[PDB]
Amino acid sequence: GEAPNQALLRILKETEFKKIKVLGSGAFGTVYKGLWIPEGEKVKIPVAIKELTSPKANKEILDEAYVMASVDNPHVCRLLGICLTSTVQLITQLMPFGCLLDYVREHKDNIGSQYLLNWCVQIAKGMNYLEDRRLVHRDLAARNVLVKTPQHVKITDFGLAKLLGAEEKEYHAEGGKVPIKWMALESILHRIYTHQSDVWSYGVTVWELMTFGSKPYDGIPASEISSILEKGERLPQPPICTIDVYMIMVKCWMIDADSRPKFRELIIEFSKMARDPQRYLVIQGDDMDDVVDADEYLIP
Amino acid sequence: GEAPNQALLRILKETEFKKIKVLGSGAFGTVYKGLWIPEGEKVKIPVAIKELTSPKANKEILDEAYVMASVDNPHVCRLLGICLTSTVQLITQLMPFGCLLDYVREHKDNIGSQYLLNWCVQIAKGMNYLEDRRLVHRDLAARNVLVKTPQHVKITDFGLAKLLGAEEKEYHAEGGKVPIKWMALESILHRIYTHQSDVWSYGVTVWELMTFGSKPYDGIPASEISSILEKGERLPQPPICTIDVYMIMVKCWMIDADSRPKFRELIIEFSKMARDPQRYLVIQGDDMDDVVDADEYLIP
Ligand SMILES: CN(C)CCCC(=O)Nc1cccc(-c2c(-c3ccccc3)oc3ncnc(N[C@H](CO)c4ccccc4)c23)c1
Ligand SMILES: CN(C)CCCC(=O)Nc1cccc(-c2c(-c3ccccc3)oc3ncnc(N[C@H](CO)c4ccccc4)c23)c1
């Protein structure tokens, strides 16, 4: 009827792995840095460990496990396993440089156009993988893209992700509590989510990167966003962005979802731009200008 | 009778230059970071400014000015000028990375053998220049070599330097107060200073670099150093040093000063070693070893 999901859910013993330090905490619970040492082999795998014993929350962690266990792509984070302790723990590959949002914020002065454009390509590849797997992410943002190395990023945080049937094109949400400033207008108005609603969020994610981590609609409270977007207002053209790049962003933000580009198209277009990055992003780097070194100023 | 010293002593107005920050203070006085802007030209020269009104000290500052004004070489710091304020100020090119001693101490983990050996060559070139100018430095150490860039260092601090006559081979000091752990044995015993006594100090300076800024004879008080050296004891072979390199150090430390190498020989020998650095210095860089990244550990 539909393709059997034959993904393997690996169960790990708590004794196999070692918590080293807390990486962060919040409403999601807390995330630890750790080492995972399977008894049989001589390997030590660096890992991130996530835990929250509420009933609804336990169901949600396992829903997140299902999705991470079912994805396998170089630009998306996979679940390594779970540990069934007093509270359930998710285990995944450590992404040492943290989320991309924080990375761009505290490396503005050393991030070149080659890296910005390559990230855009990589995220588009991960999303296209997810689309092929009939999976709608529903929470794409710079904070949900992690950095394994500065040249390799991965999509993560599938806590809102939803699978789709072969005979199904959208997902009608309920209750909500979704990040408003990253979601498509049809999602705000009618709680509809598509692969093309993820493309909107991709647009906003790209906007974050090009603005080096600025908050979208900084001065605006969530309740207005709907009407602003209804009026035809969008995120402004970032300083470093040529019209070429900003045109792609704007295309991701059109009312007619089918008019928006597909992730495979976005891969291609950003791939093209990555071949000649300084034509498409204008960055200063890539105090006074009359300064001269003493041993080039010779006796007059 | 002897070669006229036709060096120019440039006098600068205090209004020409701008103190930006104190770089350091001590018995020498204080040194400021600054910018020098000659009124006529559109240049802004980064400079270091040094001031101490004692009578003997004023004579000494001017003696230091004489020497710095009389040297011109890429591996020695020249005097740009002096400013005749309430107290006299020496002005020279800023060496932004500070003294080499501090540099090696706080970059151990990122200093490769190529840099260590090249520095050794550069210092030897500067000293050979000084020898040609008939000038005996008398205070060569890692602290008196400044870093313009990580790949270009310069000799400085001529406060003990002495000029020599064409018919003269040594300098008999008086009073003293000279750094004991860097000076040759004949200087400790008989207050004699030569170009070959500077070579001893060069040996100790190289030892500092190869030990990444260790204090020579760390546990020993100054009064013993004479007898230790008299007994045949020397600084130990640093961990990273091949016998080839340590042999050069030891040669710099022989009783018979004429047996010690000349700076021109030291230039050559270290130059040769700089062509294949990892043959002559063994450094680890140039936690566990069973660590494996999660996306190279595939499902068993
Ligand atoms: C609530 N979310 C929608 C927003 C997530 C933003 C966030 O705070 N992410 C986050 C928080 C804490 C840790 C990590 C994380 C890090 C990390 C490493 C160094 C410094 C800072 C963060 O590395 C990671 N590697 C893999 N996953 C990570 N976190 C996700 C959950 O965000 C995760 C999911 C499942 C299992 C393990 C970890 C991570 C990532
Ligand atoms: C007492 N001496 C035998 C030991 C000197 C060790 C020392 O403290 N040197 C020192 C002290 C203060 C400033 C400098 C210096 C720096 C510098 C820059 C950044 C951070 C730290 C230090 O840069 C310099 N560029 C040129 N000369 C410098 N100092 C020498 C006197 O050490 C100097 C001599 C004459 C005029 C100006 C400066 C310097 C160098």
PDB file of N, CA and C in Angstrom, chain A residues 8 10 35-36 38 41-47 74 78 80 92-95 148 152 154 288-300, chain B residues 8 10 35-36 38 41-47 74 78 80 92-95 148 152 154 288-300:
ATOM      1  N   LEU A   8      16.183   0.890  11.178  1.00  0.00           N
ATOM      2  CA  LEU A   8      16.524   0.197  12.414  1.00  0.00           C
ATOM      3  C   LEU A   8      16.586   1.184  13.572  1.00  0.00           C
ATOM      4  N   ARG A  10      18.102   1.525  16.960  1.00  0.00           N
ATOM      5  CA  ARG A  10      19.119   0.940  17.814  1.00  0.00           C
ATOM      6  C   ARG A  10      18.905   1.390  19.252  1.00  0.00           C
ATOM      7  N   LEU A  35      30.757  11.036  24.778  1.00  0.00           N
ATOM      8  CA  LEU A  35      31.475  10.029  23.994  1.00  0.00           C
ATOM      9  C   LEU A  35      30.730   8.707  24.073  1.00  0.00           C
ATOM     10  N   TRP A  36      30.593   8.042  22.932  1.00  0.00           N
ATOM     11  CA  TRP A  36      29.940   6.747  22.859  1.00  0.00           C
ATOM     12  C   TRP A  36      30.937   5.682  22.509  1.00  0.00           C
ATOM     13  N   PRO A  38      30.954   1.767  22.044  1.00  0.00           N
ATOM     14  CA  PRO A  38      30.432   0.401  21.958  1.00  0.00           C
ATOM     15  C   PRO A  38      31.452  -0.621  22.461  1.00  0.00           C
ATOM     16  N   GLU A  41      33.777  -2.919  19.799  1.00  0.00           N
ATOM     17  CA  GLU A  41      34.783  -2.324  18.923  1.00  0.00           C
ATOM     18  C   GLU A  41      35.659  -1.270  19.600  1.00  0.00           C
ATOM     19  N   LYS A  42      36.833  -1.039  19.018  1.00  0.00           N
ATOM     20  CA  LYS A  42      37.762  -0.023  19.493  1.00  0.00           C
ATOM     21  C   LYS A  42      37.528   1.342  18.849  1.00  0.00           C
ATOM     22  N   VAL A  43      36.310   1.849  19.008  1.00  0.00           N
ATOM     23  CA  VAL A  43      35.942   3.166  18.499  1.00  0.00           C
ATOM     24  C   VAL A  43      35.395   4.024  19.635  1.00  0.00           C
ATOM     25  N   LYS A  44      35.585   5.335  19.519  1.00  0.00           N
ATOM     26  CA  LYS A  44      35.028   6.295  20.463  1.00  0.00           C
ATOM     27  C   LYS A  44      34.312   7.363  19.653  1.00  0.00           C
ATOM     28  N   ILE A  45      32.981   7.299  19.607  1.00  0.00           N
ATOM     29  CA  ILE A  45      32.195   8.213  18.777  1.00  0.00           C
ATOM     30  C   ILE A  45      31.707   9.420  19.580  1.00  0.00           C
ATOM     31  N   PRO A  46      32.130  10.637  19.187  1.00  0.00           N
ATOM     32  CA  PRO A  46      31.578  11.841  19.803  1.00  0.00           C
ATOM     33  C   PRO A  46      30.103  12.015  19.456  1.00  0.00           C
ATOM     34  N   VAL A  47      29.285  12.284  20.470  1.00  0.00           N
ATOM     35  CA  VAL A  47      27.834  12.316  20.307  1.00  0.00           C
ATOM     36  C   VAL A  47      27.202  13.444  21.119  1.00  0.00           C
ATOM     37  N   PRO A  74      23.890  13.063   3.725  1.00  0.00           N
ATOM     38  CA  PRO A  74      25.014  13.838   4.269  1.00  0.00           C
ATOM     39  C   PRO A  74      24.645  15.225   4.795  1.00  0.00           C
ATOM     40  N   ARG A  78      21.133  12.125  11.373  1.00  0.00           N
ATOM     41  CA  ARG A  78      20.437  10.867  11.670  1.00  0.00           C
ATOM     42  C   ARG A  78      20.523  10.529  13.162  1.00  0.00           C
ATOM     43  N   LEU A  80      21.416   8.081  16.018  1.00  0.00           N
ATOM     44  CA  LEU A  80      22.317   6.945  16.231  1.00  0.00           C
ATOM     45  C   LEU A  80      21.609   5.847  17.013  1.00  0.00           C
ATOM     46  N   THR A  92      22.809  11.241  18.963  1.00  0.00           N
ATOM     47  CA  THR A  92      23.159  11.582  17.595  1.00  0.00           C
ATOM     48  C   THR A  92      24.600  12.074  17.516  1.00  0.00           C
ATOM     49  N   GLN A  93      25.121  12.157  16.298  1.00  0.00           N
ATOM     50  CA  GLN A  93      26.477  12.635  16.059  1.00  0.00           C
ATOM     51  C   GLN A  93      26.619  14.062  16.550  1.00  0.00           C
ATOM     52  N   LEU A  94      27.694  14.328  17.286  1.00  0.00           N
ATOM     53  CA  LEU A  94      27.974  15.672  17.770  1.00  0.00           C
ATOM     54  C   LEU A  94      28.315  16.590  16.600  1.00  0.00           C
ATOM     55  N   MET A  95      27.730  17.786  16.607  1.00  0.00           N
ATOM     56  CA  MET A  95      28.013  18.820  15.614  1.00  0.00           C
ATOM     57  C   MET A  95      28.753  19.936  16.354  1.00  0.00           C
ATOM     58  N   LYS A 148      28.921  20.782  11.407  1.00  0.00           N
ATOM     59  CA  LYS A 148      29.875  19.706  11.693  1.00  0.00           C
ATOM     60  C   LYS A 148      31.286  20.233  11.522  1.00  0.00           C
ATOM     61  N   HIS A 152      30.761  22.104   6.200  1.00  0.00           N
ATOM     62  CA  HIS A 152      29.735  21.060   6.132  1.00  0.00           C
ATOM     63  C   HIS A 152      28.683  21.244   7.194  1.00  0.00           C
ATOM     64  N   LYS A 154      24.391  20.551   8.412  1.00  0.00           N
ATOM     65  CA  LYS A 154      23.334  19.539   8.359  1.00  0.00           C
ATOM     66  C   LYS A 154      22.033  20.052   8.969  1.00  0.00           C
ATOM     67  N   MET A 288      42.399  53.383   9.190  1.00  0.00           N
ATOM     68  CA  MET A 288      42.544  54.368   8.116  1.00  0.00           C
ATOM     69  C   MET A 288      43.200  53.749   6.882  1.00  0.00           C
ATOM     70  N   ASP A 289      42.985  54.382   5.728  1.00  0.00           N
ATOM     71  CA  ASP A 289      43.515  53.895   4.446  1.00  0.00           C
ATOM     72  C   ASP A 289      44.778  54.640   3.988  1.00  0.00           C
ATOM     73  N   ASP A 290      45.209  55.636   4.762  1.00  0.00           N
ATOM     74  CA  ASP A 290      46.477  56.318   4.514  1.00  0.00           C
ATOM     75  C   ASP A 290      47.586  55.795   5.431  1.00  0.00           C
ATOM     76  N   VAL A 291      47.320  54.696   6.138  1.00  0.00           N
ATOM     77  CA  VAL A 291      48.312  54.103   7.039  1.00  0.00           C
ATOM     78  C   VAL A 291      49.457  53.469   6.252  1.00  0.00           C
ATOM     79  N   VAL A 292      50.684  53.754   6.681  1.00  0.00           N
ATOM     80  CA  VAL A 292      51.886  53.240   6.032  1.00  0.00           C
ATOM     81  C   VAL A 292      52.852  52.698   7.081  1.00  0.00           C
ATOM     82  N   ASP A 293      53.478  51.573   6.753  1.00  0.00           N
ATOM     83  CA  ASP A 293      54.412  50.906   7.648  1.00  0.00           C
ATOM     84  C   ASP A 293      55.730  51.678   7.644  1.00  0.00           C
ATOM     85  N   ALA A 294      56.371  51.782   8.804  1.00  0.00           N
ATOM     86  CA  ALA A 294      57.541  52.650   8.967  1.00  0.00           C
ATOM     87  C   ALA A 294      58.687  52.341   8.005  1.00  0.00           C
ATOM     88  N   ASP A 295      58.914  51.063   7.718  1.00  0.00           N
ATOM     89  CA  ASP A 295      59.977  50.680   6.781  1.00  0.00           C
ATOM     90  C   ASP A 295      59.501  50.605   5.320  1.00  0.00           C
ATOM     91  N   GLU A 296      58.420  51.324   5.010  1.00  0.00           N
ATOM     92  CA  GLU A 296      58.134  51.771   3.644  1.00  0.00           C
ATOM     93  C   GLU A 296      58.115  53.303   3.538  1.00  0.00           C
ATOM     94  N   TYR A 297      58.116  53.995   4.676  1.00  0.00           N
ATOM     95  CA  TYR A 297      58.317  55.440   4.700  1.00  0.00           C
ATOM     96  C   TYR A 297      59.797  55.708   4.937  1.00  0.00           C
ATOM     97  N   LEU A 298      60.521  56.015   3.863  1.00  0.00           N
ATOM     98  CA  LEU A 298      61.971  56.218   3.933  1.00  0.00           C
ATOM     99  C   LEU A 298      62.311  57.704   4.018  1.00  0.00           C
ATOM    100  N   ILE A 299      63.457  58.003   4.631  1.00  0.00           N
ATOM    101  CA  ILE A 299      63.876  59.381   4.918  1.00  0.00           C
ATOM    102  C   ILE A 299      63.605  60.336   3.748  1.00  0.00           C
ATOM    103  N   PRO A 300      62.896  61.450   4.016  1.00  0.00           N
ATOM    104  CA  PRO A 300      62.619  62.451   2.987  1.00  0.00           C
ATOM    105  C   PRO A 300      63.835  63.321   2.682  1.00  0.00           C
TER     106      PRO A 300
ATOM    107  N   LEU B   8      71.445  60.506  10.539  1.00  0.00           N
ATOM    108  CA  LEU B   8      70.612  61.671  10.805  1.00  0.00           C
ATOM    109  C   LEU B   8      69.763  61.440  12.047  1.00  0.00           C
ATOM    110  N   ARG B  10      66.617  62.663  13.629  1.00  0.00           N
ATOM    111  CA  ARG B  10      65.416  63.423  13.332  1.00  0.00           C
ATOM    112  C   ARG B  10      64.734  63.834  14.629  1.00  0.00           C
ATOM    113  N   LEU B  35      50.340  56.627  16.852  1.00  0.00           N
ATOM    114  CA  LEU B  35      50.349  56.936  15.421  1.00  0.00           C
ATOM    115  C   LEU B  35      51.145  58.210  15.188  1.00  0.00           C
ATOM    116  N   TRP B  36      51.991  58.194  14.165  1.00  0.00           N
ATOM    117  CA  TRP B  36      52.789  59.350  13.797  1.00  0.00           C
ATOM    118  C   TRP B  36      52.343  59.886  12.469  1.00  0.00           C
ATOM    119  N   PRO B  38      53.251  62.913  10.112  1.00  0.00           N
ATOM    120  CA  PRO B  38      53.961  64.099   9.626  1.00  0.00           C
ATOM    121  C   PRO B  38      53.024  65.042   8.869  1.00  0.00           C
ATOM    122  N   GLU B  41      52.953  65.176   4.656  1.00  0.00           N
ATOM    123  CA  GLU B  41      52.501  64.049   3.843  1.00  0.00           C
ATOM    124  C   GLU B  41      51.233  63.372   4.362  1.00  0.00           C
ATOM    125  N   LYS B  42      50.545  62.674   3.462  1.00  0.00           N
ATOM    126  CA  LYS B  42      49.350  61.914   3.799  1.00  0.00           C
ATOM    127  C   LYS B  42      49.658  60.477   4.215  1.00  0.00           C
ATOM    128  N   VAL B  43      50.486  60.345   5.247  1.00  0.00           N
ATOM    129  CA  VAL B  43      50.840  59.042   5.798  1.00  0.00           C
ATOM    130  C   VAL B  43      50.525  59.010   7.291  1.00  0.00           C
ATOM    131  N   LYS B  44      50.208  57.822   7.795  1.00  0.00           N
ATOM    132  CA  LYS B  44      49.988  57.607   9.220  1.00  0.00           C
ATOM    133  C   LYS B  44      50.834  56.414   9.633  1.00  0.00           C
ATOM    134  N   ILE B  45      51.964  56.672  10.293  1.00  0.00           N
ATOM    135  CA  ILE B  45      52.904  55.609  10.651  1.00  0.00           C
ATOM    136  C   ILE B  45      52.663  55.102  12.075  1.00  0.00           C
ATOM    137  N   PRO B  46      52.320  53.808  12.220  1.00  0.00           N
ATOM    138  CA  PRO B  46      52.233  53.217  13.554  1.00  0.00           C
ATOM    139  C   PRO B  46      53.604  53.144  14.219  1.00  0.00           C
ATOM    140  N   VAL B  47      53.679  53.588  15.471  1.00  0.00           N
ATOM    141  CA  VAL B  47      54.954  53.725  16.169  1.00  0.00           C
ATOM    142  C   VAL B  47      54.839  53.313  17.634  1.00  0.00           C
ATOM    143  N   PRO B  74      67.081  45.125   7.800  1.00  0.00           N
ATOM    144  CA  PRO B  74      65.729  44.568   7.951  1.00  0.00           C
ATOM    145  C   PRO B  74      65.509  43.746   9.221  1.00  0.00           C
ATOM    146  N   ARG B  78      65.350  50.370  13.838  1.00  0.00           N
ATOM    147  CA  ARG B  78      65.975  51.695  13.756  1.00  0.00           C
ATOM    148  C   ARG B  78      65.152  52.741  14.513  1.00  0.00           C
ATOM    149  N   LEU B  80      63.285  56.125  14.628  1.00  0.00           N
ATOM    150  CA  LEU B  80      62.622  57.031  13.686  1.00  0.00           C
ATOM    151  C   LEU B  80      62.966  58.477  14.012  1.00  0.00           C
ATOM    152  N   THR B  92      59.997  54.782  17.456  1.00  0.00           N
ATOM    153  CA  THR B  92      60.396  53.723  16.545  1.00  0.00           C
ATOM    154  C   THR B  92      59.170  53.024  15.966  1.00  0.00           C
ATOM    155  N   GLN B  93      59.389  52.230  14.925  1.00  0.00           N
ATOM    156  CA  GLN B  93      58.324  51.474  14.280  1.00  0.00           C
ATOM    157  C   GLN B  93      57.695  50.513  15.270  1.00  0.00           C
ATOM    158  N   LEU B  94      56.367  50.491  15.308  1.00  0.00           N
ATOM    159  CA  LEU B  94      55.644  49.572  16.175  1.00  0.00           C
ATOM    160  C   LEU B  94      55.843  48.135  15.699  1.00  0.00           C
ATOM    161  N   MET B  95      56.115  47.240  16.646  1.00  0.00           N
ATOM    162  CA  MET B  95      56.245  45.810  16.379  1.00  0.00           C
ATOM    163  C   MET B  95      55.044  45.136  17.045  1.00  0.00           C
ATOM    164  N   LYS B 148      57.451  41.820  14.143  1.00  0.00           N
ATOM    165  CA  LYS B 148      56.695  42.704  13.251  1.00  0.00           C
ATOM    166  C   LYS B 148      55.539  41.933  12.646  1.00  0.00           C
ATOM    167  N   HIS B 152      58.543  37.683  10.408  1.00  0.00           N
ATOM    168  CA  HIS B 152      59.602  38.696  10.377  1.00  0.00           C
ATOM    169  C   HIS B 152      59.858  39.277  11.743  1.00  0.00           C
ATOM    170  N   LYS B 154      62.841  41.225  14.516  1.00  0.00           N
ATOM    171  CA  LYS B 154      63.911  42.224  14.527  1.00  0.00           C
ATOM    172  C   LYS B 154      64.561  42.337  15.903  1.00  0.00           C
ATOM    173  N   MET B 288      42.003  11.109  22.366  1.00  0.00           N
ATOM    174  CA  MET B 288      42.299   9.701  22.094  1.00  0.00           C
ATOM    175  C   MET B 288      42.537   9.462  20.603  1.00  0.00           C
ATOM    176  N   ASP B 289      43.232   8.367  20.292  1.00  0.00           N
ATOM    177  CA  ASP B 289      43.577   8.015  18.906  1.00  0.00           C
ATOM    178  C   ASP B 289      42.661   6.937  18.308  1.00  0.00           C
ATOM    179  N   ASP B 290      41.716   6.435  19.102  1.00  0.00           N
ATOM    180  CA  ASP B 290      40.692   5.518  18.605  1.00  0.00           C
ATOM    181  C   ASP B 290      39.371   6.244  18.332  1.00  0.00           C
ATOM    182  N   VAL B 291      39.393   7.577  18.368  1.00  0.00           N
ATOM    183  CA  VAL B 291      38.190   8.373  18.112  1.00  0.00           C
ATOM    184  C   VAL B 291      37.786   8.296  16.642  1.00  0.00           C
ATOM    185  N   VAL B 292      36.495   8.072  16.405  1.00  0.00           N
ATOM    186  CA  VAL B 292      35.948   7.958  15.057  1.00  0.00           C
ATOM    187  C   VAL B 292      34.677   8.793  14.939  1.00  0.00           C
ATOM    188  N   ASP B 293      34.533   9.455  13.797  1.00  0.00           N
ATOM    189  CA  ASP B 293      33.394  10.319  13.529  1.00  0.00           C
ATOM    190  C   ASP B 293      32.181   9.446  13.212  1.00  0.00           C
ATOM    191  N   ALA B 294      31.006   9.855  13.681  1.00  0.00           N
ATOM    192  CA  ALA B 294      29.807   9.014  13.605  1.00  0.00           C
ATOM    193  C   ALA B 294      29.442   8.574  12.188  1.00  0.00           C
ATOM    194  N   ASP B 295      29.629   9.454  11.209  1.00  0.00           N
ATOM    195  CA  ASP B 295      29.330   9.104   9.816  1.00  0.00           C
ATOM    196  C   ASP B 295      30.530   8.486   9.074  1.00  0.00           C
ATOM    197  N   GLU B 296      31.462   7.908   9.834  1.00  0.00           N
ATOM    198  CA  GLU B 296      32.363   6.871   9.324  1.00  0.00           C
ATOM    199  C   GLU B 296      32.176   5.538  10.064  1.00  0.00           C
ATOM    200  N   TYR B 297      31.437   5.553  11.173  1.00  0.00           N
ATOM    201  CA  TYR B 297      31.012   4.324  11.833  1.00  0.00           C
ATOM    202  C   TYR B 297      29.621   3.970  11.324  1.00  0.00           C
ATOM    203  N   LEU B 298      29.557   3.029  10.384  1.00  0.00           N
ATOM    204  CA  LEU B 298      28.293   2.648   9.748  1.00  0.00           C
ATOM    205  C   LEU B 298      27.713   1.392  10.394  1.00  0.00           C
ATOM    206  N   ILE B 299      26.387   1.266  10.331  1.00  0.00           N
ATOM    207  CA  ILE B 299      25.651   0.193  11.011  1.00  0.00           C
ATOM    208  C   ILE B 299      26.346  -1.170  10.886  1.00  0.00           C
ATOM    209  N   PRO B 300      26.593  -1.840  12.030  1.00  0.00           N
ATOM    210  CA  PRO B 300      27.208  -3.166  12.026  1.00  0.00           C
ATOM    211  C   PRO B 300      26.226  -4.260  11.618  1.00  0.00           C
TER     212      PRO B 300
END
